[PDB]
């Protein structure tokens, strides 16, 4: 009987055992004189009784492991059986081509009202399952779509909304707005990453509300984990947001000369990263000479299978008139995006009478004039607001006056950068509030949520935002360990079958290491901004200072990898996670955690003459400033307690509702049909908990 | 893969991989604890700053060079040199390199034993070799004969080598240069009303030992031209704004290397250790020791050496004999360019002490 040998090009290949001893297992490949090497227990997995069988559900595979699971998916890739039941978790493979059977309306009409497991694995077999619990136990259901970036978590999401608007009433008044508006909000939040060219930098959460009789009453889409740190530092091959490259590329010269827009190389928040446009040969020649950066003149257009920046600007503005946005209101939306561009071009210096204060540079005089025309707040009043710390003596006595204490040059740059992240935060909430307005909900009871957020993210240069993304995946996997493993084994003993209430390998010590008070990593980073003379070297050395030993973390010096050999003590830290050990580099950590405004910038942008800017900063953010109201809260706040509040609030909506477990697997890196990578596909099974769930459940049955 | 060249100078400890180009790391050696009470409380300030940061912290630490008269201060501080260099300077892994360590041509035991043993048991290095700083300067010169000068802080040496073995009966170690020249500059700079008694601040003296000192063509005649004072008085600027004018003492300090009685030692100058080592070599071989006088080390980079040394040796050396003093470029890194040539040379990879041979012998039989 043969076993499975790890192979570099196949991941796992077939092979017999021809000499045997622990730590000296000689595995010969099947009818091949190839890798005739020796192994270890973690390098040898048994094979099935026969290799000529492929199964719909993996409940019929006795020698189930990762090599027999990647082999069942390799055969069902051939037969176009992309949807595959793994335990109680849907694994979906993106085929990257049009298959008529999945797009057939008879496929939805057959599956209409049919029980899970008595009918083939399909996308509609999960959407009916999180509707039968509304009739059994009377409980709300959260659809969570997980998987790599660009894996079809947004495209498979439209199949789920199409099943709900066809098998359980006709659903909400008009569906198609949700489909049309997703590339619109992906102008604002999608960017370009090393993992995939079209990648999402935010966690959208659709909330389709219903009533007591399970009929739809309206919708609400919100957003969680917005990558605002992309505004200040873009990267090297990464872009910033995709709205600035969609606004300067094709738009009028009687709009670009008037909003004072120019080529990407002139703006500070576009002076790092990739300034090239996504385009195709006809769209590239439609881009005018003045709209090109030096890098575009050198290297031309970027390559993507569907993104065209000059093409997508028409399909952006057509999707605006489909959500009810007026063309004059699109011009007020263009004034806010252009106002962020002329806010970034404020360059500060020292000098002046105070000497230790801050002033502005001479070259930012033409740029400050265009900034006060776009925002609706005066140039002189913005120059003595970016540079000062306003406080009063009225609270302490009837001799009251309001003094000003000039800030440092670095705190002027961090206040301008925090004011830029604050405007884009409320601008993104205004666009989703404009779409939410057209499908409001009346008397909610039950509701079906649909999550669309990034999986584990790790590459050559990881940072703060990749640690918040990998921590959110580590919190979701502990949720899945009490909902996929603890809950399901209560159900095998509710049918009297058997199986024990066996425990998993927990990560509760790692959870109380990142977000834990006093000794956690985020509680030492959030203390760094409160310190005078803050540094990334002082924060990185403060983790290793607080706990000398701890198996969940290590510094790059203590890592055996060659890539970490070139990284010093004070240059990064490595956290061991469910997906392995990921190094996050430290640099700009102080400013990335900084995202807050005091009263001198708040009593100017909120009180703007422009009603649109004033409505971005809507009530209760906008409030009258008056005598003895009576304290200077909330001060620092920080990105880390913005993210911890908005992550633990989504945990209370997940722990309180039922759920569906969907994993979307990318079979090849170039995104085309009929190509099976095998090793990159294995990494999506190894960075999704699949190996651990298919060993704990098996037991005595 | 590649071997690691580490020269255990007292400078200017030098570190760089085995070829093809210059040392990667040079640093002022020092370890320094913080000698004031920290009322800001830090936060988390270092227990010991090593160089380079311990030279960015003058006047607030108490600097201690890790080797003192060619012997370690203690291996507790020496190990911090090693650990700091490999991890926090070079970015080299301990078990990924054969290493090369250097010592003095004449140094007491157990300084090479204890070293070899502690680095093998602590850092677990897979191969090691220990070369004398003079032999590596022969490889740097390229010649096959000659008297070799490793003059570094704080120990100089005069080693004669003849194709291709060392001569036992003429090896001279003089403890004249270079830390006693630093301390002597501090002793004759008080003569102009300055003070530098503070340990950290002694480094400022070392920096003035570098730039403005000059050797005379002849002592007696520079003392003559000193009586005609003007051009001798040169104005240095000091980091707190102070302007120092040194002139007579300016040529007096380096002049020390000839007639060292001024320091307090009874042994004669570079002059006589050269002559007296040559005149303990056999008559026939002396012919090719003349004109293969090869200088090395950073403490030979004072201006006026070697042509003071040339004129003085040439006056005492035999009539109608050729005596040229060979002075290479960049002598401070000579020793290192030696180490680089050695560890790169085929097939002498198999003349190193490897971990299996070390496991068998421990700190025994170091020859
Ligand atoms: N231009 C110079 N003139 C005079 N002395 C110098 C000069 N540059 C360096 N030195 C001295 O040389 C010493 C460095 O010598 P080095 O070759 O490193 O000896 P070792 O290799 O034995 O440590 C320093 O202590 C310094 O005082
Ligand atoms: Mg030396």
TrEMBL record, chain A:
Domain Myosin motor stretches: 53-701
Major place of residence: other
Annotated positions binding ADP: 94, 98, 103, 150-155, 196
Membrane topology reported for the UniProt record: Peripheral membrane protein
Species, as recorded: Sus scrofa
Shown segment, full-protein numbering: 5 to 705 of 1266
Positions bound to Mg(2+) 3: 154, 200, 452
Keywords, alphabetical: Actin-binding, ATP-binding, Calmodulin-binding, Cell membrane, Cell projection, Coated pit, Cytoplasm, Cytoplasmic vesicle, Endocytosis, Golgi apparatus, Hearing, Membrane, Metal-binding, Motor protein, Myosin, Nucleotide-binding, Nucleus, Phosphoprotein, Protein transport, Transport
Residues reported in the UniProt entry to bind ATP: 147-154
Protein name, as recorded: Unconventional myosin-VI
Family that this chain belongs to: Belongs to the TRAFAC class myosin-kinesin ATPase superfamily. Myosin family.
GO MF annotation: an example: metal ion binding
Domain Myosin N-terminal SH3-like: start-end pairs: 1-49
């Amino acid at each position: 009987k043969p076993v499975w040998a790890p192979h570099p090009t196949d991941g796992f290949q077939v092979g017999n055992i021809v000499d045997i001893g622990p730590d000296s297992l000689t595995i010969e490949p099947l009818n091949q004189k190839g890798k005739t090497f020796l192994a270890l227990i973690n390098q040898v997995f048994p094979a099935e009784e026969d290799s000529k069988k492929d199964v719909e559900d993996n409940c019929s595979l006795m020698y189930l492991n990762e090599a027999t699971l990647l082999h069942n998916i390799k055969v069902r890739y051939s037969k176009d059986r992309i949807y595959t039941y793994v335990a109680n978790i849907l694994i979906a493979v993106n085929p990257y081509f049009d298959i008529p059977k999945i797009y057939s309306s008879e496929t939805i009409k057959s599956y209409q009202g049919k029980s899970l497991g008595t009918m083939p694995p399909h996308v509609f077999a999960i959407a009916d399952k999180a509707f039968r619990d509304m009739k059994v136990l009377k409980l709300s259901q959260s659809i969570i779509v997980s998987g790599e970036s660009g894996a079809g978590k947004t495209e498979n999401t439209k199949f789920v909304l199409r099943y709900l608007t066809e098998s359980y009433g006709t659903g909400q008044d008009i569906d198609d707005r949700i489909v049309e508006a997703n590339p619109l909000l992906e102008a604002f939040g999608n960017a370009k990453t090393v993992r995939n060219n079209n990648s999402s930098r935010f966690g959208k959460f659709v909330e389709i509300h219903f009533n007591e009789k399970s009929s739809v009453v309206g919708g609400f889409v919100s957003h969680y984990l917005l990558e605002k740190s992309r505004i200040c530092v873009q990267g090297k091959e990464e872009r910033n947001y995709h709205i600035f490259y969609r606004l300067c590329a094709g738009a009028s010269e009687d709009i670009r000369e008037r909003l004072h827009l120019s080529s990407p190389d002139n703006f500070r928040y576009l002076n790092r990263g990739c300034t090239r446009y996504f385009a195709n040969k006809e769209t590239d020649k439609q881009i005018l000479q003045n709209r090109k950066s030096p890098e575009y003149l050198k290297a031309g257009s970027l390559k993507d299978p569907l993104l065209d920046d000059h093409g997508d600007f028409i399909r952006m503005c057509t999707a605006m008139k489909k959500i009810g946005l007026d063309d004059e209101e699109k011009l007020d939306l263009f004034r806010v995006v252009a106002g962020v561009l002329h806010l970034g071009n404020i360059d500060f210096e020292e000098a002046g009478s105070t000497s230790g204060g801050c002033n502005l540079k001479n070259k930012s005089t033409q740029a400050l004039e265009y900034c006060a025309e776009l925002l609706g707040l005066d140039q002189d009043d913005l120059r003595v607001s970016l540079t000062t710390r306003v406080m009063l003596t009225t609270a302490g006595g009837a001799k009251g006056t309001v003094i000003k204490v000039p800030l440092k040059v670095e705190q002027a740059n961090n206040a301008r950068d925090a004011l830029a992240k604050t405007v884009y935060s409320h601008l993104f909430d205004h666009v989703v509030n404009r779409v939410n307005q057209c499908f409001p909900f009346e008397t909610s009871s039950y509701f079906i949520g649909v999550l669309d957020i990034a999986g584990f993210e790790y590459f050559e240069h990881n940072s703060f935002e990749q640690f918040c993304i990998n921590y959110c995946n580590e919190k979701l996997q502990q949720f899945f360990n009490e909902r996929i493993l603890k809950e399901e084994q209560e159900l095998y003993q509710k049918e009297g079958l058997g199986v024990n209430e066996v425990h998993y390998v927990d990560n509760q010590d790692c959870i109380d290491l990142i977000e834990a008070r006093l000794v956690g990593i985020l509680d030492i980073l959030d203390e760094e901004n409160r310190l005078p003379q803050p540094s990334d070297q002082h924060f990185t050395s403060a983790v290793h200072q607080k706990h000398k030993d701890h198996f969940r973390l290590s510094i790059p010096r203590k890592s055996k990898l060659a890539i970490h050999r070139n990284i010093r003590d004070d240059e990064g830290f490595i956290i061991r996670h469910f997906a392995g050990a990921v190094c996050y580099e430290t640099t700009q950590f102080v400013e990335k955690n900084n995202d807050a405004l005091h009263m001198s910038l708040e009593s100017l942008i909120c009180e703007s003459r422009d009603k649109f800017i004033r409505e971005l900063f809507e009530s209760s953010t906008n409030n009258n400033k008056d005598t003895k109201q009576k304290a200077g809260k909330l001060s620092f706040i920080s990105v880390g307690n913005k993210f911890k509040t908005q992550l633990n609030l989504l945990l209370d909506k997940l722990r309180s509702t039922g759920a569906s477990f969907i994993r979307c697997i990318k079979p090849n890196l170039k995104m085309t049909s009929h190509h099976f990578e095998g090793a990159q596909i294995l990494s999506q099974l190894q960075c999704s908990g699949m190996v651990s769930v298919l060993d704990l459940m098996q037991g005595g049955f | 893969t590649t071997a690691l060249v580490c020269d255990n100078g007292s400078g200017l400890v030098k570190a760089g991989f085995a070829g093809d180009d210059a040392p990667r790391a040079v640093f002022p050696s020092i370890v320094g604890r913080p000698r004031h009470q920290g009322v800001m409380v830090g936060m988390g300030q270092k227990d010991s700053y090593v160089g380079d940061e311990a030279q960015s912290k003058r006047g607030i630490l108490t600097l201690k060079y890790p080797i003192e008269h060619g012997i370690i201060t203690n291996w507790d501080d020496m190990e911090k040199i090693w650990h700091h260099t490999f991890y926090n300077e070079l970015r080299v892994a301990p078990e990924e390199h054969p290493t090369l360590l250097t010592e003095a041509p004449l140094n007491p035991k157990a300084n090479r034993e204890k070293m070899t043993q502690i680095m093998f048991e602590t850092f677990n290095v897979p191969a090691m070799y220990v070369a004398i700083q003079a032999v590596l300067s022969l490889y740097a010169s390229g010649r096959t004969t000659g008297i070799v000068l490793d003059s570094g802080d704080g120990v100089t040496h005069n080693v004669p080598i003849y194709e291709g073995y060392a001569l036992p009966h003429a090896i001279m170690r003089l403890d004249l240069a270079g830390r006693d020249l630093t301390d002597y500059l501090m002793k004759i700079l008080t003569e102009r009303g300055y003070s530098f008694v503070t340990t950290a601040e002694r480094e400022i003296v070392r920096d003035i030992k570098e730039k403005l000192c000059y050797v005379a063509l002849d002592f007696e005649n520079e003392m003559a031209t000193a009586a005609s004072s003007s051009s001798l008085e040169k104005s240095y600027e000091l980091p707190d704004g102070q302007v120092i004018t040194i002139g007579n003492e300016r040529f007096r300090c380096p002049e020390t290397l000839f007639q060292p009685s001024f320091i307090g030692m009874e042994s004669a100058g570079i002059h006589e250790t050269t002559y007296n080592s040559i005149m303990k070599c056999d008559i026939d071989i002396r012919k090719d020791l003349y004109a293969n006088n090869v200088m090395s080390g950073g403490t030979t980079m004072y201006p006026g050496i070697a042509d003071r040394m040339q004129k003085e040796i040439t006056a005492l050396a035999p009539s109608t004999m050729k005596i040229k003093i060979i002075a290479p470029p960049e002598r401070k890194y000579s020793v290192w360019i030696g180490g680089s040539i050695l560890a790169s040379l085929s097939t002498f990879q198999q003349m190193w002490i490897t971990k299996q041979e070390y496991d068998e012998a421990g700190p025994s039989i170091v020859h």
